[PDB]
Amino acid sequence: SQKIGHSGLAFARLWHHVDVARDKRTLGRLASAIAITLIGRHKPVYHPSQDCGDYVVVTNCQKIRVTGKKFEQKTYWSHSGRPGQLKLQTMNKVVADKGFGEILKKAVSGMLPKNKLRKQRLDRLKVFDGSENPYKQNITAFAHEQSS
Template sequence: MKTYRVRPEDVQRNWWLIDAEGKTLGRLASQIARLLRGKHKPYYQPDVDCGDFVVVVNADKIRVTGKKLEQKIYYRHSNYPGGLKAYTLRWMLENKPEEVIRLAVKRMLPKNRLGHRMMKRLKVLRGPEHPYVAQKPQKLEVEA
């Protein structure tokens, strides 16, 4: 029996729609990362980009457990001396909820060119409407 190697041009890409309302941040991010990598497909290969497109709506209505709203801190640096900025999760959810989900998923993907390509297929939106109706994304229920 010969080993089957999938080629990038043979990959079938689907569109998935995930509603983040009431979902826990980490559990949601791991499911999204799984779809972006293509691990749900029978022909998954770690070195081939075989993932799907994922559209996440209602990013501002995600849930976190414990004391993470005050204790989890996101850092940014402007590359100038003294340019380190720190933001709590509460501030990020009020001002940039899309960025919270995007960063959680990004840190679960490979840290190379393949991971950057996968991140381009993630679309995170604050409200319930999305502009990807023409692609006919399939609704996916994720465990809370």
């Protein structure tokens, strides 16, 4: 009974926004949180046989919080098939190369379920080191929130 009705809004992909400048969660935690959103576990209509997750826009990713000495010491790895071609890059190095966004993305990828849907979900997450971005318009926004 309950499942019957117009279900179009449930399975609508919302765009969420997280300002990492105004969020005090440290990297990993934040990533984990994002993962849930991506999967769509937050919504009661979720079923594992279905990608129903929302879009997440992360902005000001340069101000992400990383604890301890991880910025210097935390090493990301990449291997071709060819022996001797192990690349090991420190987080800072990676940031310099690509950006904090990349870091965040990696974490999210790690978090996510390892199946076909993964890649799509990952791509749903849009990250920007600084503030500006092309999705400003499409973040979910209510009419009552317009006091500011």
